[PDB]
């Protein structure tokens, strides 16, 4: 991916995070678990539903379009009519296939950027109260109980509070 996160420094995905597209896995003395990140999953679902609606709205429905009949003395306009019908089909087929190919690439890069944005948000929060251990994990220098973990996932982690409590 263009942003190095998905299939990048975060080596793989989580079948155990079921409530969203991006999120957290935590691990402290009380226990472990997954939790989707609602705010960022929501923003992506906004954009992707918008993307799909955009594709729909641009392909107005085809109304009644039947063929025509020609005599054995009208083959030039018969072939012209065939040329027109075939031509437009070749063009909408190209348009349809190309749009989906290009939008598919952008959609995947979009998800990749969203994961990277989330990781950097947490990194910016924890600063040097935790060790960046690669694979997208932060190892805390202080005890981080469930309330501590919950505050990281809310974006209201308290870097001054824990900077004095390092192990």
């Amino acid at each position, epitope marked *: 991916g263009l942003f190095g996160a998905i299939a990048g420094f975060i080596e793989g995905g989580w079948t155990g995070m*079921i*409530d969203g597209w991006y999120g957290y896995h935590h691990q402290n003395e009380q226990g472990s678990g997954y939790a989707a990140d*609602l705010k960022s*999953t*929501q923003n992506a*679902i*906004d954009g*992707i*539903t*918008n993307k*799909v*609606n955009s594709v*729909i709205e641009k392909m107005n429905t085809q109304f009644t379009a039947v063929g025509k009949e020609f005599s054995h003395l009208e083959r030039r306009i018969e072939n012209l009519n065939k040329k027109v019908d075939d031509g437009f089909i070749d063009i909408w087929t190209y348009n349809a296939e190309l749009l989906v190919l290009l939008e598919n690439e952008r959609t995947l890069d979009y998800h990749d950027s969203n994961v990277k944005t989330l990781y950097e948000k947490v990194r910016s929060q924890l600063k040097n109260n935790a060790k960046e251990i690669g694979n997208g994990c932060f190892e805390f220098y202080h005890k981080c109980d469930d309330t501590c973990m919950e505050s990281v996932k809310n974006g209201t982690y308290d870097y001054p509070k824990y900077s004095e409590e390092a192990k």
Partner: antibody
Amino acid sequence: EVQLVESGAEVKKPGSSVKVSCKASGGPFRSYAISWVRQAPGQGPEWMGGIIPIFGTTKYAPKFQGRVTITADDFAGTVYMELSSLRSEDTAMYYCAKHMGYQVRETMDVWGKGTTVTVSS
Amino acid sequence: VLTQPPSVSAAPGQKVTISCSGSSSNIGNDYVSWYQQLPGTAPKLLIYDNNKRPSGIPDRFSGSKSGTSATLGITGLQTGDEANYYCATWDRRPTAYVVFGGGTKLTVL
């Protein structure tokens, strides 16, 4: 705003099943969940279950767990609710309501006008 | 389930309060919403996330949550405010689901 429009009224016999629908304006894909809530005469609302956009996952209340099936035709901007083994106690007004976001939750901010299902012998 | 008083009454211009009491599985660990219901019409959201109002709900409606009990408040009581009021929340009891209170009928004199 958003308009939720339920399908017509239904009158069905016990043990049969009914499939009501809820058509939403705009879209047709939505970024918010939709659930179904019913309310029997002289009673409070009771949630039945809901469905999540893109993921398509569903949650059902324990009381209807096992005989309710919520589905979505996102291209038609429509959501369906099928309830089976109908009892007389199922006679109520059925509403579809949307949630503020993509997860089903206690907060449903916009409701349809409701449709009635009558279950009698 | 959530328990509310079955019925409360007051004269116009007064302030009433509707209590919603649950357990640690519902109200004590999740947000609480309130709905108003008029005869013939669908439930109308008044309060979400314990104490926030949607657009269009007047200043005199308010909510709060203390530990295990939530509370709806209405001031400047009007004749049009005579309806059924329901609290709702996200119960983690058996399988998680949305649970409504029993309801509270508000009568104006």
